[PDB]
mmCIF file of C-alpha atoms in Angstrom:
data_model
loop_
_atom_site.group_PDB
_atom_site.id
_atom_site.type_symbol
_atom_site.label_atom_id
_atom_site.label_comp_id
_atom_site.label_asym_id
_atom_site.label_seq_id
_atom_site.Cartn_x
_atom_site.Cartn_y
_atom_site.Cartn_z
ATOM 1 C CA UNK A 1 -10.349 39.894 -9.857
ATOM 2 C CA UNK A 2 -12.963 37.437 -7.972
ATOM 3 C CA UNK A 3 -15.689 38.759 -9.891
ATOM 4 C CA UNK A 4 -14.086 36.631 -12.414
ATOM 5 C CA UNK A 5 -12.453 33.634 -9.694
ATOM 6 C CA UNK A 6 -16.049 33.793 -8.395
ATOM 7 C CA UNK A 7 -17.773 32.828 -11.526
ATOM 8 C CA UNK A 8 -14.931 29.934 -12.310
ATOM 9 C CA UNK A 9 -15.910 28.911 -8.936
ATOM 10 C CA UNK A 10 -19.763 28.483 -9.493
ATOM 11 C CA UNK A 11 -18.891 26.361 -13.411
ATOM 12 C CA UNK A 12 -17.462 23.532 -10.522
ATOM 13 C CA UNK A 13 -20.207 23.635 -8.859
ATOM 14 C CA UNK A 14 -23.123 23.664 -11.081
ATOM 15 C CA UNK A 15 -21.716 19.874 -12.108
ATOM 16 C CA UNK A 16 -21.883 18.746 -8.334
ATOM 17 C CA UNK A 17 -18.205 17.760 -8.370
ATOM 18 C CA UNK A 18 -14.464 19.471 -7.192
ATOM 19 C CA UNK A 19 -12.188 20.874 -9.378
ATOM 20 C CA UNK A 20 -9.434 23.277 -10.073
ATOM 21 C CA UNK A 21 -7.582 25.584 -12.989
ATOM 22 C CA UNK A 22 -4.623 26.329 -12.988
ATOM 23 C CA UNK A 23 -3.212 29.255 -15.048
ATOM 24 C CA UNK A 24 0.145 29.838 -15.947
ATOM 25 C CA UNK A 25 1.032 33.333 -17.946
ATOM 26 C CA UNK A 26 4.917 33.931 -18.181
ATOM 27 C CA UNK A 27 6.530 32.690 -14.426
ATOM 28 C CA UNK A 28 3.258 33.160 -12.747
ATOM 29 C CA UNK A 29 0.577 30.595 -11.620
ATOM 30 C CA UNK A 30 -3.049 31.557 -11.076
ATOM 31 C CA UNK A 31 -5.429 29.049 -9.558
ATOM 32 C CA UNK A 32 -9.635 28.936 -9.872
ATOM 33 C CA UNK A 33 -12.100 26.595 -9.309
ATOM 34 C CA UNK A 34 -14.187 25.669 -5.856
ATOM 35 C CA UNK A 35 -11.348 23.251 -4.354
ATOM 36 C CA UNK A 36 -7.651 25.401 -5.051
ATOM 37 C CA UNK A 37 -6.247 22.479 -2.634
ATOM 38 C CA UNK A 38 -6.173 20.218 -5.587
ATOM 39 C CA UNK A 39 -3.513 22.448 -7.633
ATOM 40 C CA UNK A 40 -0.792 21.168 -5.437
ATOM 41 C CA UNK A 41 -2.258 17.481 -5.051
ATOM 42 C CA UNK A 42 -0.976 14.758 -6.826
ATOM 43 C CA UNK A 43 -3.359 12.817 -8.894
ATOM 44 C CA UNK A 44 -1.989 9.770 -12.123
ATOM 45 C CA UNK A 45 -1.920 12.049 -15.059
ATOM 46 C CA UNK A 46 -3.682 9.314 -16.938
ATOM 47 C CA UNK A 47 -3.828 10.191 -20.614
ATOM 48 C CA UNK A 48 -1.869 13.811 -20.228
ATOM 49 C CA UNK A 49 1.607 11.408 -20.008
ATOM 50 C CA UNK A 50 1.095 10.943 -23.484
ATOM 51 C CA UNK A 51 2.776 14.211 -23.580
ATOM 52 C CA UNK A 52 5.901 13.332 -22.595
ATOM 53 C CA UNK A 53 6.214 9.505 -23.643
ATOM 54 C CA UNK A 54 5.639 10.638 -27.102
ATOM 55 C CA UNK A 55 8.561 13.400 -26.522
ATOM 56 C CA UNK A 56 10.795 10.453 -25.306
ATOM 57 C CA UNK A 57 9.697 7.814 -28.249
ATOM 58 C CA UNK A 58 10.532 11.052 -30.734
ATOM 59 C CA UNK A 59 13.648 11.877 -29.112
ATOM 60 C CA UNK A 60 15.478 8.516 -28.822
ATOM 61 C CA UNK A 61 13.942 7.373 -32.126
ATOM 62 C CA UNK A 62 11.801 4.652 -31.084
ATOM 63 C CA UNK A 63 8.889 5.787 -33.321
ATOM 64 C CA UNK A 64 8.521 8.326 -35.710
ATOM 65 C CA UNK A 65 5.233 10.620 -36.759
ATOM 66 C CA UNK A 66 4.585 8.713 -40.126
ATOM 67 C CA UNK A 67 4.901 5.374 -38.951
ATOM 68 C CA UNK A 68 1.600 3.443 -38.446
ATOM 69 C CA UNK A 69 0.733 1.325 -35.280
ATOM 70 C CA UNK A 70 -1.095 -1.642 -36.593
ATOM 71 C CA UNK A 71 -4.321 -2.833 -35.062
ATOM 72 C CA UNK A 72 -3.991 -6.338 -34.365
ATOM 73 C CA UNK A 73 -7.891 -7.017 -34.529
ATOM 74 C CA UNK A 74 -8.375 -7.744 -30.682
ATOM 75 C CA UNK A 75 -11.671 -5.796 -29.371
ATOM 76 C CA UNK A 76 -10.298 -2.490 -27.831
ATOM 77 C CA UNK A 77 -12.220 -0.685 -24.645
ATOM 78 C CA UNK A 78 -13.521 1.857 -27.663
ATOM 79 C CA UNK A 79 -14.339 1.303 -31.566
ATOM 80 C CA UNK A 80 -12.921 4.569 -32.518
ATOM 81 C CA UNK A 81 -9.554 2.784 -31.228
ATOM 82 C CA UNK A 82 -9.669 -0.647 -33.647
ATOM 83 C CA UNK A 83 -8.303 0.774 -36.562
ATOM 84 C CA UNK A 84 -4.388 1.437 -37.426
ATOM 85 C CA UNK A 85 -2.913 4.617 -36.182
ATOM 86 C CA UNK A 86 0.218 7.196 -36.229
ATOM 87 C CA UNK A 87 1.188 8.619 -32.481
ATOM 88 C CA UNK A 88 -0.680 11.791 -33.453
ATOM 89 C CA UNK A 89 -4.017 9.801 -34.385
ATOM 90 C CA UNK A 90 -3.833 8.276 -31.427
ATOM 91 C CA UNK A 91 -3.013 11.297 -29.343
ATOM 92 C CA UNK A 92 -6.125 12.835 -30.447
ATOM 93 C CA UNK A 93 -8.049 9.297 -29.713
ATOM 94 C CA UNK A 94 -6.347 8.991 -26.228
ATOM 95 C CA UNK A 95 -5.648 5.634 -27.623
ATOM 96 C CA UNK A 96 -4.096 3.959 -24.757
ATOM 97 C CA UNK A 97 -2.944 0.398 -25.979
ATOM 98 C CA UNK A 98 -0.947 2.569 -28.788
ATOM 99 C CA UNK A 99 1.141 4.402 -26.845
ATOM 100 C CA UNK A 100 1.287 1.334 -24.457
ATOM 101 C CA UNK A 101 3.132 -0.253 -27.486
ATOM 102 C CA UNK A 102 5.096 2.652 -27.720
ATOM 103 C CA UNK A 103 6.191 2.656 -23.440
ATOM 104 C CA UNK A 104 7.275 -1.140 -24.471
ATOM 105 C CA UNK A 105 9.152 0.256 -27.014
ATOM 106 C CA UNK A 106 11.273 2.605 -25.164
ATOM 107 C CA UNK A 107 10.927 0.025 -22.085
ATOM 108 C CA UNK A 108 11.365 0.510 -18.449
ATOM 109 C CA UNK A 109 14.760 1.620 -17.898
ATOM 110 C CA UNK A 110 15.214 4.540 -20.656
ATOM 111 C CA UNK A 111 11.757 5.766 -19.578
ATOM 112 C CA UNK A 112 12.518 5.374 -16.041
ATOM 113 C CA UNK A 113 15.648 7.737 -16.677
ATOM 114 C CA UNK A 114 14.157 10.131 -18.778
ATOM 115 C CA UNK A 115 11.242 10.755 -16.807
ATOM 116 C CA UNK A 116 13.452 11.400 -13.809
ATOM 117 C CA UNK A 117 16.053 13.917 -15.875
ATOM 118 C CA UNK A 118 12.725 15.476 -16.713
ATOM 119 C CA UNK A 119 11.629 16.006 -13.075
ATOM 120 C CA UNK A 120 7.879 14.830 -14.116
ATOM 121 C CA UNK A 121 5.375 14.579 -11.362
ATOM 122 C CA UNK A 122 7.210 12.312 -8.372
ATOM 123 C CA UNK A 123 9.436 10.795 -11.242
ATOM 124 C CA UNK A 124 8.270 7.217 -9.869
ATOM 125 C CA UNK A 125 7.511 5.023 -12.727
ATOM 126 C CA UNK A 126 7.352 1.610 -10.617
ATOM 127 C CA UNK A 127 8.472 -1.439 -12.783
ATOM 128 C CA UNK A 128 5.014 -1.634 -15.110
ATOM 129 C CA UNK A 129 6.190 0.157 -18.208
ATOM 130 C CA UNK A 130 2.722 0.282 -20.172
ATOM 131 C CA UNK A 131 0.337 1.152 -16.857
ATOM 132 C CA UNK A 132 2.214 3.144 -14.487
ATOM 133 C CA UNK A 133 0.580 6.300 -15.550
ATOM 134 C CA UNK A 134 -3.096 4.991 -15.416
ATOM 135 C CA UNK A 135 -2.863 3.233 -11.962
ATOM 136 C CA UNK A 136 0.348 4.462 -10.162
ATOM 137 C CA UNK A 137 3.018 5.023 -9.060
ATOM 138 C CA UNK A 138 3.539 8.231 -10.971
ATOM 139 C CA UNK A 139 1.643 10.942 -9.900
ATOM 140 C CA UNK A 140 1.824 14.930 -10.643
ATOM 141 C CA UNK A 141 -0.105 18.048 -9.712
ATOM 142 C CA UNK A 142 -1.820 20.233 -11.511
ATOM 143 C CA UNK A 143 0.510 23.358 -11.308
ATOM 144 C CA UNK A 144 3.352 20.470 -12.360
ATOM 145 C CA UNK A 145 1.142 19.987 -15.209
ATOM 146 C CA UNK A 146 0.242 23.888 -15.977
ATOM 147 C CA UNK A 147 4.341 23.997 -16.057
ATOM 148 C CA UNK A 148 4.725 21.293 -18.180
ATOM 149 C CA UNK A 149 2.928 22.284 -20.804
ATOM 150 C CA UNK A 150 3.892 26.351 -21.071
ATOM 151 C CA UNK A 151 7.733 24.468 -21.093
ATOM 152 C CA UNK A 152 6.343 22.568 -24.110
ATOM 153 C CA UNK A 153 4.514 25.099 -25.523
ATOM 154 C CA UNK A 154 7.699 27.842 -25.460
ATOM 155 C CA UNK A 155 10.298 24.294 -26.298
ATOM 156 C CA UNK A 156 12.291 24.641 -23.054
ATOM 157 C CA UNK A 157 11.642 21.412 -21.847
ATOM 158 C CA UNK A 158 15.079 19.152 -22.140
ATOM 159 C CA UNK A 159 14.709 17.589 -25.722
ATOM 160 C CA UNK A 160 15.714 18.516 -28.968
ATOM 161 C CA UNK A 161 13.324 21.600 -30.435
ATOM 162 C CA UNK A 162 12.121 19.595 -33.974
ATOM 163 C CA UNK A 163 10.837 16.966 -30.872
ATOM 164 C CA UNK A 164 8.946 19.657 -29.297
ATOM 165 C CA UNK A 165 7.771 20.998 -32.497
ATOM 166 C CA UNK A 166 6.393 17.578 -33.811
ATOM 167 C CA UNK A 167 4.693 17.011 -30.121
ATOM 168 C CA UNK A 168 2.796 20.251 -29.947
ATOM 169 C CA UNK A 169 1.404 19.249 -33.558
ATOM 170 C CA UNK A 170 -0.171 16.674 -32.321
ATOM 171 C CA UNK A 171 -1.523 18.978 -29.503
ATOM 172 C CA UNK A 172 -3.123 21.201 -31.585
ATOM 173 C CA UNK A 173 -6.844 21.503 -31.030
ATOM 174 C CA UNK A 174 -8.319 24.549 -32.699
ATOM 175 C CA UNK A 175 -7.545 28.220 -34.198
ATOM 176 C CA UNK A 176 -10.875 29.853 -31.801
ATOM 177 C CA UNK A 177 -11.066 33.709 -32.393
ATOM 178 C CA UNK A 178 -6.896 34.324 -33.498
ATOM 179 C CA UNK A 179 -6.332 31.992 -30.784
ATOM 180 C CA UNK A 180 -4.290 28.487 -31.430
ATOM 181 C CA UNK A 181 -5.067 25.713 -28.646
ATOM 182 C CA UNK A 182 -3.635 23.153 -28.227
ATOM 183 C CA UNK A 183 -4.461 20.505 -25.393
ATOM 184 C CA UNK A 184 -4.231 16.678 -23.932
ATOM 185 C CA UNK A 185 -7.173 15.338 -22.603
ATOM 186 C CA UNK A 186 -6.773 12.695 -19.422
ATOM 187 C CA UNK A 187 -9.003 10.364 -17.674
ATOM 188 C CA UNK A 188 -8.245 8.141 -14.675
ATOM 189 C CA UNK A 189 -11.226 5.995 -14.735
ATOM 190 C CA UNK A 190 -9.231 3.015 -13.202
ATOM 191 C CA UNK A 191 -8.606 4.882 -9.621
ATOM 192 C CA UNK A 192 -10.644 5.717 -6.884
ATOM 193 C CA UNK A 193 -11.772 9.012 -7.555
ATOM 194 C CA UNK A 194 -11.797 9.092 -11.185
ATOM 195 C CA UNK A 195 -9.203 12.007 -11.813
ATOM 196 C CA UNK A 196 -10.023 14.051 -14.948
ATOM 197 C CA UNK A 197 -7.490 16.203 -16.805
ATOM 198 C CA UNK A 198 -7.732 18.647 -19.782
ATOM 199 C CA UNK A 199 -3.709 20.563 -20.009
ATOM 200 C CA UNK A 200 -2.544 22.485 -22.548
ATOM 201 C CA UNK A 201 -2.185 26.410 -23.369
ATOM 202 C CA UNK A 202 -3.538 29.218 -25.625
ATOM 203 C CA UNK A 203 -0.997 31.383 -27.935
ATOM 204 C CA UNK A 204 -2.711 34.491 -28.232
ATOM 205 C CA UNK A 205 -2.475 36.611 -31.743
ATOM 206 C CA UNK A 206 0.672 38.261 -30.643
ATOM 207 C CA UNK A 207 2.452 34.940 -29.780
ATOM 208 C CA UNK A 208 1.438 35.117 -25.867
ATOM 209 C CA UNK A 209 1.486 31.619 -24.138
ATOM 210 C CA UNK A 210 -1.027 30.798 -21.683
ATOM 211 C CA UNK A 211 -0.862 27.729 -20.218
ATOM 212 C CA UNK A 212 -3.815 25.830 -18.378
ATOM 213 C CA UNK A 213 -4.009 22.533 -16.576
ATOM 214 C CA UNK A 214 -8.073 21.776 -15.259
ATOM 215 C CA UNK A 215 -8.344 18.884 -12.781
ATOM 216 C CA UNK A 216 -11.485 17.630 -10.994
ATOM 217 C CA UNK A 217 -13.021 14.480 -9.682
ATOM 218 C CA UNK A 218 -14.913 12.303 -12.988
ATOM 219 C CA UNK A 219 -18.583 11.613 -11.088
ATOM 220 C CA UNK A 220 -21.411 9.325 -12.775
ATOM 221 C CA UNK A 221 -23.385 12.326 -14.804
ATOM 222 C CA UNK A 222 -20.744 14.151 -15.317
ATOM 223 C CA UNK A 223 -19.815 13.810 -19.282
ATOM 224 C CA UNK A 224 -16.367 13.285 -20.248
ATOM 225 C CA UNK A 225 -17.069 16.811 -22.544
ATOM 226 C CA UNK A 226 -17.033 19.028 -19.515
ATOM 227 C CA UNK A 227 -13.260 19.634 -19.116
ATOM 228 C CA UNK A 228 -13.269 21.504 -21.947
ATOM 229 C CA UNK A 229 -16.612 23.073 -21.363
ATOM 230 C CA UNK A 230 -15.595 24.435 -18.116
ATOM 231 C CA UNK A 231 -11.636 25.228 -19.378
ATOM 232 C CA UNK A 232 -12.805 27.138 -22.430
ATOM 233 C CA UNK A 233 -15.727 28.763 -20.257
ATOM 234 C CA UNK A 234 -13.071 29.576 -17.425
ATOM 235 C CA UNK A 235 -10.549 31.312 -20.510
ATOM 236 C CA UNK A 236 -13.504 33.425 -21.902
ATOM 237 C CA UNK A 237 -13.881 34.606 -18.339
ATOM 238 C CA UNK A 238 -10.596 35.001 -17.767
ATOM 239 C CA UNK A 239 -10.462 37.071 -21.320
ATOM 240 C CA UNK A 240 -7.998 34.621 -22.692
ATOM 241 C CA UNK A 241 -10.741 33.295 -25.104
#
């Protein structure tokens, strides 16, 4: 209804920024939030590519889910990062300089061609392997993002299943009320507006996938915690929590 958009409308702007949800339930999109021009913007996906440059590492083998990414003792922009770590710590961490190793890994021209066969965002990778998601080129919206993840959530994006499977583990947020969640956190602090991210999707009890991509401007006073504050605030209302 818009008793319901209303409300998702007013979590936006209690925090004094813009922002948007988009909702994806079968083929359908839904957007909410007090600035539904940003669904269809393009904005770095910052951390959220870890998505999809851990489905390429899996799929071409140039990392597995055991392995462990040393630290190499060199101060990192967070303590939580300086410690050793497998892809799916470091998914949960957002540790960036890991899956930088692992963009090195797969290098520029592989990633360059799988991101394109993938159709993600504008497909435009530049010639920076282990940045071009943080500062540009590549850029997606956030209804190419609420796509992206029901694909990965129901395994019809275009890699091998088991590589799906062992992505969405490391996804996986929370059982909340029957409900699994799983979600990727993003933060573009190193643009001009910060771009915040929080995609993923809900199965419901009966298998149901919902999937969600939340994007807003990052302000000073606004805490890194609201994305999922205002997603998981924005499902209750929605009666998806």
């Amino acid at each position: 209804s818009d008793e319901k958009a209303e409300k998702i409308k007013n979590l936006f702007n209690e925090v004094h920024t813009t922002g948007v949800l988009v909702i994806q339930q079968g083929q359908t999109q839904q957007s909410y939030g007090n600035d539904l021009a940003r669904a269809s913007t393009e904005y770095v996906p910052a951390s959220t590519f870890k998505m999809l440059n851990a489905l390429i590492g899996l799929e071409h083998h140039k990392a597995t889910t055991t392995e462990v990414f040393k630290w190499d003792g060199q101060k990192r922009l967070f303590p939580e990062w300086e410690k050793d770590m497998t892809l799916g710590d470091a998914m949960k961490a957002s540790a960036i300089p890991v899956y930088q190793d692992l963009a090195r890994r797969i290098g520029l021209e592989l990633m360059s061609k799988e991101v394109k066969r993938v159709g993600y965002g504008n497909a435009d990778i530049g010639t920076q392997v282990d940045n071009f998601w943080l500062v540009g080129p590549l850029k997606i919206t956030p209804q190419q993002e609420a796509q992206f993840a029901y694909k990965l959530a129901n395994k019809t994006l275009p890699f091998s299943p088991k590589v799906q499977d062992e992505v969405q583990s490391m996804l996986f947020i929370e059982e909340k009320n029957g409900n699994k969640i799983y979600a990727k956190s993003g933060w573009g602090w190193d643009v001009d507006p910060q771009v915040g991210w929080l995609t993923g999707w809900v199965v419901q009890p009966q298998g149901n996938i919902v999937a969600f991509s939340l994007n807003l401007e990052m302000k000073k006073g606004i805490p890194s915690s609201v994305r999922k504050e205002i997603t998981y605030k924005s499902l209750e209302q929605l009666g998806i929590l």
